[PDB]
Structures are given as C-alpha cells and as structure tokens.
Amino acid sequence: MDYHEDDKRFRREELCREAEFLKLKMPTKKVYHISETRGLLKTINSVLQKITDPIQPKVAEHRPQTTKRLSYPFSREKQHLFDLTDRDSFFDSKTRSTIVYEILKRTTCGITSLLANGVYSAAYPLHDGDYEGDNVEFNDRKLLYEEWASYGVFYKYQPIDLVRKYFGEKVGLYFAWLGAYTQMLIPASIVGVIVFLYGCATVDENIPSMEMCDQRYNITMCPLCDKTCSYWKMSSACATARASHLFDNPATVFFSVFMALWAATFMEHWKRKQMRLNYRWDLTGFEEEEEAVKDHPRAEYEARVLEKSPAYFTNLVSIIFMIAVTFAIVLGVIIYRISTAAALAMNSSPSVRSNIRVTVTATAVIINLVVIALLDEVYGCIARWLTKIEVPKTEKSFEERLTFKAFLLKFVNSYTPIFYVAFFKGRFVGRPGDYVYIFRSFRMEECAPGGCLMELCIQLSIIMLGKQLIQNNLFEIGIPKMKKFIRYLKRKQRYEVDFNLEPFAGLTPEYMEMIIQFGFVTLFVASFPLAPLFALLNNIIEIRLDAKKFVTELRRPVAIRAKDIGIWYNILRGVGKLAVIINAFVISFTSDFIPRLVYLYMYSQNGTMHGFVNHTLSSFNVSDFQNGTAPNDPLDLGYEVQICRYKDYREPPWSEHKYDISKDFWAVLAARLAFVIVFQNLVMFMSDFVDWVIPDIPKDISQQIHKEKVLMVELFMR
Amino acid sequence: MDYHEDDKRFRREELCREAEFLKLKMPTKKVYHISETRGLLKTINSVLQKITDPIQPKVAEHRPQTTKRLSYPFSREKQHLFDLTDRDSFFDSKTRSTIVYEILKRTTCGITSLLANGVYSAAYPLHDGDYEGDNVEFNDRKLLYEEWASYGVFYKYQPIDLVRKYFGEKVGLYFAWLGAYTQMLIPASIVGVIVFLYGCATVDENIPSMEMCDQRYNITMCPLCDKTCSYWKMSSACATARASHLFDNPATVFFSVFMALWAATFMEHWKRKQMRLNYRWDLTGFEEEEEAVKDHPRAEYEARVLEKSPAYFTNLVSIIFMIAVTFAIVLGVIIYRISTAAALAMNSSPSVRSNIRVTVTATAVIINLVVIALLDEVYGCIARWLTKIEVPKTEKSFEERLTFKAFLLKFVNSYTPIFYVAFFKGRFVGRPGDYVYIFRSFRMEECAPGGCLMELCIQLSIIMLGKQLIQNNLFEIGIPKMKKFIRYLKRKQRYEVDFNLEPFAGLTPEYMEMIIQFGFVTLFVASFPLAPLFALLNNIIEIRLDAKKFVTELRRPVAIRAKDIGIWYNILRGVGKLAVIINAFVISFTSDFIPRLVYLYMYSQNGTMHGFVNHTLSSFNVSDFQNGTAPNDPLDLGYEVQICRYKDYREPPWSEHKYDISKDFWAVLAARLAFVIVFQNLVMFMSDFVDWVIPDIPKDISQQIHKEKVLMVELFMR
Ligand SMILES: [Ca+2]
Ligand SMILES: [Ca+2]
Ligand SMILES: [Ca+2]
Ligand SMILES: [Ca+2]
C-alpha cells in the first residue's frame, strides 16, 4: 500500500493559530502545481506530496539537466537536456525529490523562513526501501548498504555512479574525492614504510648513535631544570636518541621531497578525476546565479535601511575575526603551557616514581587534546554565531564564509601544539648561565633530553593514532547513536520510520576532518615519516564508516548539485603551498640532519664523522651558576661533576669570552637557512613544473566531448 | 574606378608548367563560391577576388561571430550571431577579409603548401585608402594614421575599438596591453623618482659615505690585480661609493616591495581590462579545435609511417634543447669573460691613460651588447629550425613551442650578463693570500673599487637607455626602411602599391621585446631604481612608433581572432614569480643594505653606526704574499704600506689564525639568508593575497552579461 511519494513535510498537530494559519495559506501556493496529501500517526501527523508527471517537464526545461538520450556512440549513450525523449516513466526519485524541493523553495513568505519560525520541523525526502530486510524488493538503498557500506567489502572499489544517483552530486563528489585520496595515499604510504625500514636498517650503523651509547666516558649534562633535579648522563637518554635517529636520516629529506611532490600530483590527479566525473555525469554543473532566494536578514536589513534613511561592517567583522583567531592561537599556546604543568615536582612531595618519563608527556598531550576538543566546540559555535551576524548575501556566500572561518579556527587551535613544540620549544631559552623569565617568575620552557624532535614525534604519532583512528571515529559512531538510545529510553510507515532518523548537518564536518588529516599528512611528514600509513588506515575505516552512517543513521539528503568540489580544493592548494615552507623549517630547525651535514663537511678533519656530540656539547663551569639556580643535589651519580655540558654551540668557559655566542653557532645557522632557501625554491619550482607538465583534461574526454557534440549537431538538423 | 575588392593573390607571370597547372587547378576549388578576377601591371601580374554578398551568410552561420543587432539596452546595443538582422550592407572589410582568407584556407592540395612551394608569393588583403593624401575620402586607415600613429598625439589615449575593427583582434589586444602597461607603469615610475629623490636627499647625511670621504686617514687597499697595479686609497673610490649609496638606502627595499606588489596588481588589472575588452567585442573568442588544417610535415610523416610499418622524438628534441640553452648560458658567461678583456694592461704598453675607468666598463658592455645581438640572431634562426624539426601538430602548437624556445634563448643570453655581474662577480675569488686559477692560469675575475653594485647599476642603466630607447627603436625604424631604399636603388593601383610594402612577421617580436623590458623592470629594480622611468619613455615611444609602423611600413595583416593574449600572460606570471626570488638575492647579496643593518644591530656599541668601513676592512700583512703576486711598485702613493686592507670579513693577521674565515662572515651570511627568507615568503604571500582580494570580473560586466542574456531570452520567444 506504500505508493510513490516525494518529500514529506511536517504539520504541528495540537503564535500557534498564526502558525496553522500560515501553514494553510502557503499550501495554496504549494498546490499551484501539486495537490498535497496528509498523514496519520500516534505522536504528531504530517503532510506529503504526490507529484504528477508533466510538472517535472514543466520545470525540466525550466531547470535544464542533461538527462539520458535514445542514441549511443560506441556502446555509451550520450545525454541531452529535455526534448522528445518521451519515455514518461524514466525519472529518478533523486531528480523528482530535488524538483519538488525546488518547488518548495519557490514559495514566498519562503520555506526557509518557515523552517526558521518553528511552524514546521523538517521537510526531507523519503528513503525508498528498508535496508537488510527479510524480503525486500531490491531497492538501491538496501543494495548499496549490502555492497558498499559494510567493512567486509572494504577491499574492493566504490560504486560512484550509484551513490551519486541515489544521493545527489555533492555526496558523490565527496566520496569520490575520498576514494581518490586513499588511492593516491597508497603509494606514498608504501614509500613511507620503505624509508622507515631504511631507518631501521641504519638504526645501528650510523656513527653518532654509537657515540652516544658508548659507555665509560661519563658524559655529564647540565640539569635543564631550575632547581629540582641534578646532573645526569647522556647515555641515560641514548635510548630515546637512538629512537630519534630513526626519523631524521638523510633519507627523510628524500621522503619529504617525495611527499610534497606527492601532494602536487594528487592535486592534479584529483582535478583530472573530477573532470572525468563531471563528464560521466551532467556535462556542466553550471547554474544561473541568484537561483537561491536572498537570505532572510538580507531582506530584513533592506527594509531596515528602507525605514532608516555598510562598507564598515565587513571590515569590522573581519578585524574582530582577526582578534578572535589571534586570541585563539595565544589560547592554544597558553593551554599547552598549562599542559606542561601535568605533574609538577612529582619527585619532591608525591615521590611515586613510576620512572617512565614518556607517560608524563602522554598525559600532557591527553589533557591538551581534551581541552582542545572543548575549544573546538566553543569556536565552532561562536564562529557560526559570528557568521550569522555577518549578514551575508546568499547561502553559497554565507556557507563559504562560515566554513572558512571555522576551518581557520579549527586549524590554528589543533596545530599550534605541534607548531609550538617544533619551532618555539627551546629556541628561546637562554644559556645555562641565565634564563629568560616568564613574567619575572622562573625558566620559561625546556625540552626533553635526547633530541627535541622525539617529543614532537610521539605527540604527533599518538595524535594521529588517537584523535583520528580511535577517538574521532568512535565518537562519530557513538554520540548520535547514544542520543538515539536516550530517546529510546523515552506497520511503521516510511514517514513514520523516517521521522526518528537524524537530521542532516551538511558535508562540512567530513570535509573539515579530512582536510585536517591532510594538513597533518603533508605538513609534518619530514620529522615523522609513516604518517601516510595512519592516514591510510583512518581513510579505509572512514569511507565505509561514513557510508554506513549515510545509509543507516541519517535521513535522506536533499541532493543539491554542484560540479565544483567547493572551497575545499582551494584549501587543499593552500595547505599544499604551506607544506613546503613548513617542511623546510621542520628539517632545518628540528632535525639533526643539517648540523650532521655541516659537521660532516667543515669540521670533520677525517672522512666520516666522529665526536659530533663531543663537538656540539659546549661545557659550563659549575662555579658560574646564578644564585638559587644551582641543582639541589650534586649527587655524583657517576664519575664526578666539575663542569656540565650542553649542546648550544657556545665557546668553552676557559676562553676570555665566557659563554657568549660562539662562531660555529653562526655557521650552523647559516647552513640551516641555506638549506631552507634551496629546499623551498627548488621543490616549489618542481611542484609548479609537475603541475604544468600534467594536462588537466586527459586524452579520453578532450576528443570525446567534441565527438558527442558532432553527434548532437549531426542529429539536430532533421 | 577602384571598386570593392578583397584579399588579392599572386600569379607568377613568365616546375613552372606544373606551377601554373596547379595555379589553374586550385582556382577551380576557389570558384566554388567566388569567381576570381585578374590584374595587369608592369613587373608581374596577379589575381584578385570580388566576394558576392550571401557567401558571407553562407559561412557566417558556419563561422558564428556575434555581429551587431537592431535593439539596445541603455544606449549600448547588444550583439548576436547571425539571423534576421538583414541590413545587407553592414559587413566590415576586416570581417570580409578574414572570411575570404578562411575560404582560401579551405582549399586542399592547401594554400599553406602552395605558399611553401613558391607558385605564389603572398596573398594578403588590401589596405583601404592612402594615408596623408591630398583629397582622400576619410578612410579609417588615414584617419587612424592622423589621430593615433604620430608622436604629436602621444599625450592622449589610444582608440582601441577602431584599431581592433581595422586590424583584427590580435593586434588590438596587443596594443591595448601596451596601453595598460604604460598606464600601470606611470605610478610605479612616479614612486620610483620619489625614492630616488629620497636617496639624493640623503646622499650626504648618511654616515658611511662621510666615513669613506673623510680624508687624512690614508685608508690603503690591497691591489685587487694580479701584478700590474699598486695599492691605493679608498677615498679615490669614494666618488663612486657616494654614487653607490644613492641606490641602496633602506628605502630601496621599500621600492622593491612596491615594485613586486605593482607587478601583481598590474597582472590583475590587465586580466580585468582584457575581460572587459572581450566583453566590448565578441562575447567569447572560443573556436572549435582543429579549425586549422593539420601541418604539412605532420601529414607527410603520417604517410611516411604508412609506408614504413615517436615517443622518443619529443624527448630527444627537448634534451637537445636543454643542451642548447646550457651551451647558451655558458657562451653568455664566457663572452662576458671575453668582454672583460677590453683593454688589458693599458698601463704597461700603450700608456695612453685617459684616466676615467668608467669608459673601460662601458666599452666592455658595448662589445658584449653587439656580440649578444649577433647571438640573438643566430639563436633565433637555429631555434626556428629546431622547432621546424620538431614536427608539431598544429600551427597554434608549433607557434607556442617556437615562441617558448625563442624566449628562453633570448632571455638567458640577454640576462646572464647582469646575473653574472650581480651574483658571480667576486663571490668566488679567494682571499688576498691565494686566488683561484681559471684553468691554472691566473686570477679569475675581480670587480671595481667602491662597491660591486655600481658596476651593475651602470651596465643595466645604459643597457636600458641604449638597447631599448636608442638602439632597438632606431634599428626597427631603420632596417626595413633601408631595405626599401636598397630596392629603391634598383595611377599606382592599390595592389600595385600594396605589393612593395613589407610582409608581416607576426606579433612575436613586439611581444618578445616588451617582455624582455618587463623582465628588466621587475627583475632588477631593487639595485637600480628608476628603471620604470626608462621603461615609460621606451613605451611612450614604442606605442606610437609601432602604430606608425603598422599603418605605413607594413602590409595589411590577415586579422585572425583570439580572445586570449596568448602564451605571454603565462610568461608574465612566470617572470613575476621569478621577480621576488631574484629581488631578494639582489638586495641581500649585492647591496650594502643587510650588512649595514647587521652592523647597526650587533656590533654597534653606540646608537648609530660609525667605522662600518673600519669594521669590515680586514687587513693583510704584506709579507704573506705569494711568489709573483706582489704588486710591481709599492710606490707609497700616500702615507706608507705595511699592511693592506680588504673588506672580506676575515680576521686580522696578528691572530694565531692567519686569514681564515672569521666569525662575523658567518654572522652576516646568516643575516643575509634570514632576510632572503623573510622577504621572499612575506611578499610572495602578499602577492597571492592581492591576487585573491582582487576580483577578476568587475561589477560592471558581471551583471551586464546576464542582463543582455535576459534581453536575449525575452526577445527570443516570438
Ligand atoms: Ca573520525
Ligand atoms: Ca568522521
Ligand atoms: Ca626598440
Ligand atoms: Ca620594437
């Protein structure tokens, strides 16, 4: 008895009298083409539509889409707009749904203001067919859930054509983009594990690792705490140092070059795939501007200046946005400063002494992650509020400005931890003699023994494991399900089952999360190789997970059309242009690559290197400490202390210069900047060259569109 | 008696019998629409055409151009393709000429192969009307020569519409581009002379100039020659040093930032002007691909592999092109090395002693300029030959590849003088103790006293004066005129007068020369401000000069159509992207800006600077010379010599280190690279931001194209 319907509405069964008055007035506008029909239920009833056929011809030449034809060149039919195809039973419920949605948009108060009132609840099309049923008559939703949206069929491809024709163009483009993303993430991940195993095959045969773990030399160290620690041996940090060697060999620079070139070729390959996709569907997705009705506060402000009687308002909301994002980055760095106070002075009062010193930084990044998720929530909501106060012109413009503001907020708050740990961790602290004070209090911030890269490597590694594979996937699969179970604490028609499903929130969260992952996996690959492995695993989970989400825990979308990806290809190009200038900085300002090379070239006095640590570790006469800055226990853990060493490129204390800037500091900084210059310029040239040499329209469409134009112009005479 | 004609041909009046046989066969193809007519003359006769009217309707819907309409919105008529306008006497001779040229192209052997044979000479349309006559009946060529192409009307604008409608789209776009170029060159030139007068207003009040010209201190100098000179005083070079101060103040960095931002906004403004221009003419210049007949050796090679039975050939001609351009840059630097041997050892044997030392470098750049003009000729001819051996597909592809190869050749051979003088002049010579030998002969190359910038400044200044204002303009106005006078050593119908005029050589020389000038005036503005002044003068001459050239000493062009500028906007964007990375290098590696700033910041021990020269001038004990490297006359010109000074950032000889690399050398190199990094990254961001924030379609076309589409769709019903 379930007939052929389209795009139900909501009636609010028992101001409310004004609400039902307009909810009966506007259906007189809505029966200008199609008479409605209503429904019955137990909670609250609703309205419904039954389109008759020629109305879709009445708007089809008014909304010209290139539907199917009768002819075919080479066993692949061509497409034309609307004339004399006349099959009369060949439309699709996606097309019929977006047509009747267009008609619902056509009414004027419009339907958007009606939804903003509360006279309705939601007006969304109905899903055709119950998935995973007992005897269900092969509808495309159930077939798609069977063969696309469960993890057993993760190994085979994605049915792009059917997911488009059932969900519309936007979700089809998004999932085809995720498919191209994973398939281009495959070879970069394979070369990533190749360079990782190169690191493991030279985890021993490199020299400074052995020079660090060679015992009996009793290489002491300055305490790197204000007062609550003592001197110690570098060979106690040799484990983390040998671990750090794994990521910064002279092959990780090749890996970084490969990943930047990979971002370039992925961008070009996705342009080509999207062009072929738009060929395989509607030949253009071009629609005439101002198709949407102008937004409600636009016309309200029009009437306001009509009763009142500008250029300052966009600029003032832009500068207050700049103040917002600057307070956001400062709040990110101060919340990382707070996260450095995870367990301050556990030695003195608690004295539990778990003796790991990898669990404390893990606790720090854990509390940073939970507070930054909360700040993501606050920034998203207040950014949506601010873009509402924007009063933008159209929904395309409002949506673009909103997603730009929200991506800038999310990007800065979820990247300034890693940026701060890379380039502002110990670059600012003074020498062992004197330390810079934070609001005249004490030492600012100092980082772990055995390289300052490994802290960032572990933080980024477990941010990529946790907040992508585990945390975000599990909360996305759980939180709407848990809201459903909360309501579940509190026959079955297709409207009746479609009411309880979750409303749609757009494509912005999936785009935003995947672009955050892209920002990781092309901004911080040089210090941390095998980021494409975790991005591959998250994507393998994510495509089928969000497929299952769409087909099970989501109401039917409205199936809008847009041949462009959106703002997100521009944001991808932006992150790809930022990738080289941050990879250069991470190689030349965190890794031990460039000092290793400059010591191999200049001060070697031999073929290969030896005593590199014995070269960089400048000493410090312990008589020259400041008052109070002495360690509380010169315990003589090993040999003895008379001096302490530290690798800050300074002169020895016995020189007439005491602890000033030595020359080799200027030498290594010169070589560092020389590498940044040559790296950035050369590989930026190589990126723009591999974008020039790649055609953006391949040799299979470039002739074929003209060939079907030949077929059209030869048929069109008579 | 001069009736209404179109596009004459050439008949070769008395193999030759085969020549006249095909020259009678193909006119049977050519009378498929239009019967010909012939002519009589004294030297050698010709053929001619008289189009009848409806043939242009017969190809007009076949070649759809948006001609004029009958209606108008807002006193500006709209345009439509070809239906029911029916004025029957409204075509233009430009349109009729390109139509009959299209018909001449339509014949198959085609007309291009016929011109390649020699059976013809040339087939070009006729100019309508003799310019500057006594009683001439107001034809557009004479009017255009009166009011556009003579230097008295240089002060007013350019008539873009009429020069298009008389010459076609390509020359119209070119001259409108030159107009936009000059009009956007105006404000950059004004700010250039502002920063120049700032330099003149601080030519005295800066400190190191006074510290150089302060006498009685007897600041000696190392000889900077192998053997044939002596020591000397820096105050003898203080004149050129005070001149050098004029160009490298801390305001020339602002000027360089302004010029790079100017290149960005000129690019955007020219995109906007070209878009508005294409609105003001044909709404699209889009034509269906493969409109041209495939090239002759393409089909010949098709038949060759048809009788013979690839991917290697494009790659082998590309690598041989790379070998060609590498030999070109090496030949440029070796010809500058030869040009350094202008007058070697004039002191010893000739002893004329003109005592200028500005005339010798002028002679060097003069001989470099004449030999590089000869090399331009050789490279252009052999590059045309190589692109013929390319066997390209179409004339668009062949022309693009040819102009790319020729521009790369011309650009490298006419820029490696300035690049070599900037960044490879004295950066490679050793210390005064030991010098690097060129093929174990003697000292490589050393540059002038009083800064090494001023040599480049004078060389670039007089290359911009001579080889743009004087030499190229005078040879372009002279050489075809002189060939005409050579033939002049050896009634008057329009064909009869049109035969003796010069054939057309395309737009590539004017584009190429103007892009070379752009490359100067945005690649080397930082060292040499007021390059926009000379570019403004050359352009003010050049627009009216080439206008006069077109309308007087040039046959009528064929008036092809293309809505794009061509490859030249891409080449402009390329030079604009190279501009920042070469301006950064010229500021931080030739100027005295960044060492001035690093001495102002670090080693000052005072507020402002003093003894900057006394800081950089490291000394040299004269006992430590090599054998033979001593000067031939320790003449004691002034005080006395016991040591010689030189500004190469080395330690004094009395240190236990003798003449090694000092620390402050590493310091200033670090600061240099830091400035290159911050400059390049910041202003590249500012360029891409000022390209983002500028819309590429203004608010006067964006609505108006849709408004005339509204008019078209409202008229088109009935
Ligand atoms: Ca997730
Ligand atoms: Ca997700
Ligand atoms: Ca010239
Ligand atoms: Ca010229």
For residues B689 and A469, give the distance between their C-alpha atoms in angstroms, rounded to a whole number.
35
- The distance from CA B435 to its chain's CA centroid, rounded to whole angstroms, is 38
Q: DSSP character for B33? A: T
Ligand 4 ion: nearby residues, β-carbon < 5 Å: B 476
Cα dihedral A362/A540/A576/A366 (nearest 10) = -10
What are the φ and ψ backbone dihedral angles of B443, each rounded to 5 degrees? -60, 135
For residues A660 and A431, give the distance between their C-alpha atoms in angstroms, rounded to a whole number.
9
Q: Residues 6 or more apart from B160 whose CB is under 8 A from it?
A: B172, B175, B176, B179, B277
CB contact under 8 Å between B706 and A663, yes or no, is: no
Q: What's the Cα-to-Cα distance from A608 to each of A210, A242, A247, A473, A594, rounded to whole Å?
A: 14, 19, 20, 48, 15
User: Is B667 inside a domain boundary?
Assistant: no
Give the strand pairing for B47-49 and A47-49: unpaired
Q: Considering only alpha carbons, which residue of chain B is nearest residue A702?
A: B289
Q: With beta carbons under 8 A apart, name residues in chain A contacting B706.
A: 288-289
Give the three-class secondary structure for A6: strand
Residues B190 and B73 in one domain: no
Residues B107 and B168 in one domain: no
User: Is A580 inside a domain boundary?
Assistant: yes
Residues B80 and B172 in one domain: no
Q: DSSP character for B6? A: B
CA angle A607, A611, A617 (to 5 degrees): 140
For residues B377 and B511, give the distance between their C-alpha atoms in angstroms, rounded to a whole number.
17
Whether residue A670 lies within 8 A of chain B, CB to CB, comes out as yes
User: Is B716 inside a domain boundary?
Assistant: no
Could you identify the residue written with the tokens 């057309």? B504
Cα dihedral A145/A150/A153/A158 (nearest 10) = 60
Q: DSSP character for A626? A: P
Do the beta carbons of residue A459 and residue A361 sit within 8 Å?
A: yes
Neighbours of A39 (CB within 10 A): 15
Q: Two tokens at A103?
A: 């008609």
For residues B670 and A666, give the distance between their C-alpha atoms in angstroms, rounded to a whole number.
7
Which of B457, B455, B452 lies closest to B647, judged by CA?
B452
Side chain identity, residue B377: E
Q: Residues 6 or more apart from B471 whose CB is under 8 A from it?
A: B369
Q: Residues 6 or more apart from A490 whose CB is under 8 A from it?
A: none
CA angle A565, A566, A572 (to 5 degrees): 80
For residues A234 and A215, give the distance between their C-alpha atoms in angstroms, rounded to a whole number.
10
Give the three-class secondary structure for A172: helix
Is residue B370 left, alpha or beta, with left meaning phi > 0 and alpha meaning psi from -120 to 50? alpha
Q: How many helices (H) and strands (E) does chain B have?
A: 25, 4
For residues A573 and A270, give the distance between their C-alpha atoms in angstroms, rounded to a whole number.
12
Breaks following residues of chain B (C-to-N distance > 2.5 Å): 14, 109, 309, 490
Whether residue A666 lies within 8 A of chain B, CB to CB, comes out as yes
For residues B103 and B457, give the distance between their C-alpha atoms in angstroms, rounded to a whole number.
55
Q: Two tokens at B300?
A: 């010949």
CB contact under 8 Å between A677 and B677, yes or no, is: yes
For residues A94 and A139, give the distance between their C-alpha atoms in angstroms, rounded to a whole number.
13
Do the beta carbons of residue B7 and residue B49 sit within 8 Å?
A: yes
Q: With beta carbons under 8 A apart, name residues in chain A contacting B662.
A: 663
Give the three-class secondary structure for B104: helix
Neighbours of A132 (CB within 10 A): 11
- Which element (helix H / strand E) includes B38? strand B36-38
> Residue B677 is nearest to which of A577, A676, A688, comparing CB atoms?
A676
Q: Two tokens at A2?
A: 């379930």
Ligand 1 ion: nearby residues, β-carbon < 5 Å: A 472-473
Residues A47 and A177 in one domain: no
Whether residue B677 lies within 8 A of chain A, CB to CB, comes out as yes
Q: DSSP character for B283? A: S
Bridge partners, A38 (sequence order) = A47
Q: Ligand 3 centre from B546 Cα, in Å?
A: 9
Which of B136, B141, B130 lies closest to B166, judged by CA?
B141
Residues B260 and B396 in one domain: yes
For residues B124 and B559, give the distance between their C-alpha atoms in angstroms, rounded to a whole number.
10
Do the beta carbons of residue A127 and residue A498 sit within 8 Å?
A: yes
User: Is A147 inside a domain boundary?
Assistant: no
| Number of alpha carbons in the 13 Å side-chain half-sphere of residue B617 | 19
- The distance from CA A276 to its chain's CA centroid, rounded to whole angstroms, is 25
CA angle A451, A224, B670 (to 5 degrees): 60
What string of H, E and C letters represents the secondary structure of B131-192?
CCCCCCCCCHHHHHHHHCCCHHHCCCCCCHHHHHHHHCHHHHHHHHHHHHHHHHHHHHHHHH
Do the beta carbons of residue B676 and residue A677 sit within 8 Å?
A: yes
Do the beta carbons of residue B37 and residue B133 sit within 8 Å?
A: no
DSSP code per residue over A467-490? IIIIHHHHHHHHHHHHHHHHHHH-
CB contact under 8 Å between B681 and A289, yes or no, is: no
Q: Ligand 3 centre from B159 Cα, in Å?
A: 22
Q: With beta carbons under 8 A apart, name residues in chain A contacting B663.
A: 663, 666
Residues B42 and B118 in one domain: yes
CA angle A324, A327, A330 (to 5 degrees): 150
Residues B167 and B119 in one domain: no
For residues B106 and B713, give the distance between their C-alpha atoms in angstroms, rounded to a whole number.
35
Do the beta carbons of residue B219 and residue B617 sit within 8 Å?
A: yes
Q: With beta carbons under 8 A apart, name residues in chain A contacting B674.
A: 673
User: Is A145 inside a domain boundary?
Assistant: no
Q: With beta carbons under 8 A apart, name residues in chain B contacting A688.
A: 577
Give the experimental resolution in Å.
4.1
For residues B411 and A533, give the distance between their C-alpha atoms in angstroms, rounded to a whole number.
45
Side chain identity, residue A348: S
Whether residue A602 lies within 8 A of chain B, CB to CB, comes out as no
CB contact under 8 Å between A289 and B706, yes or no, is: yes
Q: What's the Cα-to-Cα distance from A39 to each of A13, A30, A125, A398, A494, rounded to whole Å?
A: 11, 17, 15, 35, 11
* Min Cα–Cα distance to chain A from B581, Å: 8
Give the strand pairing for A36-38 and B643-646: unpaired
Query: What does R_g of chain B's alpha carbons equal in angstroms?
Result: 32
Ligand 2 ion: nearby residues, β-carbon < 5 Å: A 476
Experimental technique behind these coordinates: cryo-EM
For residues B283 and B278, give the distance between their C-alpha atoms in angstroms, rounded to a whole number.
6
Cα dihedral B140/B144/B146/B152 (nearest 10) = 170
Neighbours of B298 (CB within 10 A): 14
Helices of type H across A501-601: 508-523, 531-552, 568-589, 594-601
Q: Ligand 4 centre from B510 Cα, in Å?
A: 6
Residue B447: domain span: 160-595
For residues B293 and B110, give the distance between their C-alpha atoms in angstroms, rounded to a whole number.
8
DSSP code per residue over A16-81? HHHHHHHHHHHHHHHTTT--EEE---SS---EEE---TTHHHHHHTTS----B-S--STTS--B-S
CA torsion sign, B369 to B370 to B371 to B376?
positive
DSSP code per residue over B247-259? T-STTHHHHHHHH
Q: Ligand 1 centre from A491 Cα, in Å?
A: 36
Which of A580, A687, A676, A684 lies closest to A261, judged by CA?
A687
| Number of alpha carbons in the 13 Å side-chain half-sphere of residue B56 | 23
Residues B364 and B434 in one domain: yes
Residue B86, marked binder:
no
For residues B253 and B234, give the distance between their C-alpha atoms in angstroms, rounded to a whole number.
27
Q: How far apart are the first and last CA of chain A?
A: 46
For residues A6 and A55, give the distance between their C-alpha atoms in angstroms, rounded to a whole number.
13
> Residue B674 is nearest to which of A577, A581, A673, comparing CB atoms?
A673
* Min Cα–Cα distance to chain B from A630, Å: 31
Do the beta carbons of residue B174 and residue B546 sit within 8 Å?
A: no
Could you identify the residue written with the tokens 């040999």? A639
For residues A228 and A471, give the distance between their C-alpha atoms in angstroms, rounded to a whole number.
36
User: Is A607 inside a domain boundary?
Assistant: no
Q: Two tokens at B448?
A: 């002038």
Report how many domains make up chain A.
2
Domain end marker among A562, A595, A628: A595
Q: What's the Cα-to-Cα distance from A646 to each of A4, A165, A215, A231, A623, rounded to whole Å?
A: 78, 65, 18, 11, 16
Residues B94 and B206 in one domain: no
Which of B409, B415, B407 lies closest to B512, judged by CA?
B407
Query: What does R_g of chain A's alpha carbons equal in angstroms?
Result: 32
Q: DSSP character for B627? A: T
CB contact under 8 Å between A677 and B673, yes or no, is: yes
Do the beta carbons of residue A536 and residue A193 sit within 8 Å?
A: no
Which of B84, B98, B81 lies closest to B283, judged by CA?
B81
Give the three-class secondary structure for B48: strand
Bridge partners, A36 (sequence order) = A49
Bridge partners, B319 (sequence order) = none
Widest CA span in chain A? 103
Do the beta carbons of residue A509 and residue A542 sit within 8 Å?
A: no
Residue B214, marked binder:
no
Neighbours of B1 (CB within 10 A): 3
Chain A interface test: which of B401, B662, B668, B677 (most A C-beta within 10 Å) = B677
Burial of A143 (0-12, 13-18, 19+ CB in 10 A): middle
DSSP code per residue over B498-550? HHHSPPP--SHHHHHHHHHHHHHHHHSTTTS--HHHHHHHHHHHHHHHHHHHH
What string of H, E and C letters represents the secondary structure of A180-236?
HHHHHHHHHHHHHHHHHHHHHHCCCCCHHHHHHHCCCCCCCCCCCCCCCCCCCCHHH
Do the beta carbons of residue B48 and residue B9 sit within 8 Å?
A: yes
For residues A300 and A282, give the distance between their C-alpha atoms in angstroms, rounded to a whole number.
36
For residues B125 and A457, give the distance between their C-alpha atoms in angstroms, rounded to a whole number.
72
Give the three-class secondary structure for A377: helix
Bridge partners, A6 (sequence order) = A49
CB contact under 8 Å between A288 and B706, yes or no, is: yes
Give the three-class secondary structure for B589: helix
User: Is B34 inside a domain boundary?
Assistant: yes
What are the φ and ψ backbone dihedral angles of B681, each rounded to 5 degrees? -65, -45
Q: Helix, strand, coil % (nearest 5) of chain A? A: 55, 5, 40
For residues A490 and A486, give the distance between their C-alpha atoms in angstroms, rounded to a whole number.
7
Residues B121 and B165 in one domain: no
Side chain identity, residue A627: N
Burial of B618 (0-12, 13-18, 19+ CB in 10 A): buried
Do the beta carbons of residue B517 and residue B535 sit within 8 Å?
A: yes
For residues B36 and B34, give the distance between their C-alpha atoms in angstroms, rounded to a whole number.
6
Q: Two tokens at B324?
A: 């060609």
Ligand nearest to the CA of B550: 4
Which of A512, A577, A619, A500 lies closest to A42, judged by CA?
A500
CA torsion sign, B178 to B184 to B187 to B191?
negative
User: Is B638 inside a domain boundary?
Assistant: no
Burial of A157 (0-12, 13-18, 19+ CB in 10 A): exposed
* Min Cα–Cα distance to chain B from A677, Å: 7
Domain end marker among B551, B578, B595: B595
Q: How far apart are the first and last CA of chain B?
A: 46
Which of B141, B63, B149 lies closest to B99, judged by CA?
B63
- The distance from CA A648 to its chain's CA centroid, rounded to whole angstroms, is 37
Q: DSSP character for A152? A: G
Q: Residues 6 or more apart from B315 whose CB is under 8 A from it?
A: none
Do the beta carbons of residue B47 and residue B36 sit within 8 Å?
A: yes
Q: Two tokens at A127?
A: 């899903």
DSSP code per residue over B608-622? S---HHHHH-EEEEG
Orientation of helix A663-692 relative to helix B663-692, angle to 10°: 30
What string of H, E and C letters represents the secondary structure of B295-324?
CHHHHHHHHHHHHHCCHHHHHHHHHHHHHH
Q: Residues 6 or more apart from A547 whose CB is under 8 A from it?
A: A144, A148, A149, A163, A175
CB contact under 8 Å between B289 and A706, yes or no, is: yes
Q: Two tokens at B254?
A: 């602002």
Neighbours of B718 (CB within 10 A): 3
Domain end marker among A560, A595, A630: A595
Q: With beta carbons under 8 A apart, name residues in chain A contacting B673.
A: 670, 673-674, 676-677
Q: Two tokens at B84?
A: 């029911």
Residues A81 and A194 in one domain: no
Cα dihedral B467/B469/B472/B474 (nearest 10) = -130
What string of H, E and C letters represents the secondary structure of B375-410?
HHHHHHHHHHHHHHHCCCCCHHHHHHHHHHHHHHHH
- Which element (helix H / strand E) includes A423? helix A416-423
Residues A498 and A423 in one domain: yes
